[PDB]
Amino acid sequence: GAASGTKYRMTLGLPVQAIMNCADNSGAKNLYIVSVFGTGARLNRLPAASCGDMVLATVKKGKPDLRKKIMPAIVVRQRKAWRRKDGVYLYFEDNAGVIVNPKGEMKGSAITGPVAKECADLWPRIASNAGTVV
């Protein structure tokens, strides 16, 4: 919410309880998705996220200081393929996210691995720490 504007609809691939990798040097090894920001009301429907989303996650493996607490995170890579507006279906080799604050500023300083273009446009702070895009 209120990252850089509007993002096109993308195929959801990371529902709740999904464990994705952590793509920054904050000290966490994985992110366990607890909730997804912006999810509406629908019976029995599990909230899910795509690249550039603003999920809430916990650290299951990593520093004990970073463990046992909820923290905002941004999804940067997903295994599920999604279609761009130019009719291109693309997907990454893994599901990965980065720990951020409610404003979207990364807790870490460097991003390892590629970053989706949609996430880069939505969150400029992620784009600065990112290397290659798509």
Binding site: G5, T6, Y8, R42, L43, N44, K85, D86, G87
Partner: protein, 384 residues
């Protein structure tokens, strides 16, 4: 508790098979006496689907001035033949047809509509009417003057030229098309001069126009509530099945309500989809039907190997964006929009950059036979 929206819409009831196949216009556009005389509907045949790439002209959009890929539906629209005129008087019980005037000569295609076995019949359908037309030519004028003096709605009888369409059906589709324009007298005169004459698709519709598509959807047969109404599947432990509704009603009322999902027919229903934009009105007498200003290859609008289960489109066609009701080769009705369009999307001109002509019978990778020849080189049967 745990509220959720109801499954399905109560406006599309009953979910029965449509009583027709052609697809009728339930409401023609409101008549205006200032604009010139024109038609308000047309008939075509769904040839198939493809996709196109075009530059998106939309200020403020993320993909502004950037190429986007969109799916389109191709509908073959050869010119229709006007063979009759019908006048409707406005009675306090609705619109009532006063009289119908037909043309002197009617083709075999339209004459087949009035028969179940045309070949076995004696081909006596408008013989005496033609005799009256040729006897002294006063009854036709008298009826036309009656339509001019009375009546407020004028509709011409026009039939499709299915003969020049690869469909095996020889019987033509006949339809009443309301004539909008200035004054009933001009409407009747326009019909009279257009008797036994062809009306083209580009005279009725134009590029970038928003229209409506009316047709009967693809038949699906009987179907359970899970796929007919999108209900939740019951757990695996459910005895005696799990693809049903667990509670179909409650005590008092001791009856099953009309709002409860039940198994039954799930297809072959009359629908009209609104706001279909015309991306291209192509002619059947040019070799660049599928050629754009950014792709100068002389190719027509036909996938490699022809349209799947349809054939080759050699007549005029339309490139409505998105999907349309009904399967391939079904006759579809195109109607002028009843609403007024002023949004950016509706008013945006469309300039296609590329139209896919690869085979839809598989994972086609060659747009044209020449491109296939150049890539593949010489083959064993090709050289000898």
């Amino acid at each position: 508790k745990f509220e959720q929206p109801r499954h399905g819409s109560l406006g599309f009831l009953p979910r029965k098979r449509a009583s027709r196949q052609r697809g009728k216009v339930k409401a023609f556009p409101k008549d205006d006496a200032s604009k010139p005389v024109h038609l308000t509907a047309f008939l075509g045949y769904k040839a198939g689907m493809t996709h196109i790439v075009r530059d998106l002209d939309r200020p403020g959009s993320k993909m502004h001035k950037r190429e986007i890929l969109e799916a389109v539906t191709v509908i073959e629209t050869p010119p229709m033949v006007v063979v009759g005129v019908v006048g409707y008087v406005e009675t306090p019980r609705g619109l009532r047809s006063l009289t119908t005037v037909w043309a002197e000569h009617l083709s075999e295609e339209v004459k087949r509509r009035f028969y179940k076995n045309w070949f076995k019949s004696k081909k006596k359908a408008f013989t005496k009417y033609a005799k009256k037309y040729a006897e002294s030519t006063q009854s036709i004028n008298r009826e036309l003057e009656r339509i001019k003096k009375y009546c407020s709605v004028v509709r011409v009888l026009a039939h499709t030229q299915i003969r020049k369409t690869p469909l095996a059906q020889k019987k033509a589709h006949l339809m009443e098309i309301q004539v909008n324009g200035g004054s009933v007298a001009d409407k009747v005169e326009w019909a009279r001069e257009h008797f036994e004459k062809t009306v083209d698709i580009k005279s009725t519709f134009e590029q970038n126009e928003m229209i409506d598509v009316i047709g009967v959807t693809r038949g699906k047969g009987n179907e359970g509530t899970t796929a007919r109404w999108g209900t939740k599947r019951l757990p695996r432990k459910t005895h005696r099945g799990l693809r049903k509704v667990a509670c179909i009603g409650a005590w008092h009322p001791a009856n099953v309500q009309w709002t409860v999902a039940r198994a039954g027919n799930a297809g072959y229903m009359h629908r009209t989809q609104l706001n279909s934009k015309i991306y291209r009105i192509g002619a059947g007498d040019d070799a660049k039907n599928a050629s754009t200003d950014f792709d100068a290859t002389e190719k027509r609008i036909t996938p490699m190997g022809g349209f799947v289960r349809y054939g080759v489109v050699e007549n005029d066609f339309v490139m409505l964006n998105g999907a349309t009701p009904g399967p391939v080769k079904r006759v579809l009705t195109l109607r002028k929009s009843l609403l007024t369009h002023t949004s950016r999307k509706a008013l945006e001109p469309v300039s296609l950059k590329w139209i896919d002509t690869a085979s839809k019978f598989g994972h086609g990778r060659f747009q044209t036979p020449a491109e296939a020849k150049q890539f593949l080189g010489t083959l064993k049967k090709d050289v000898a």
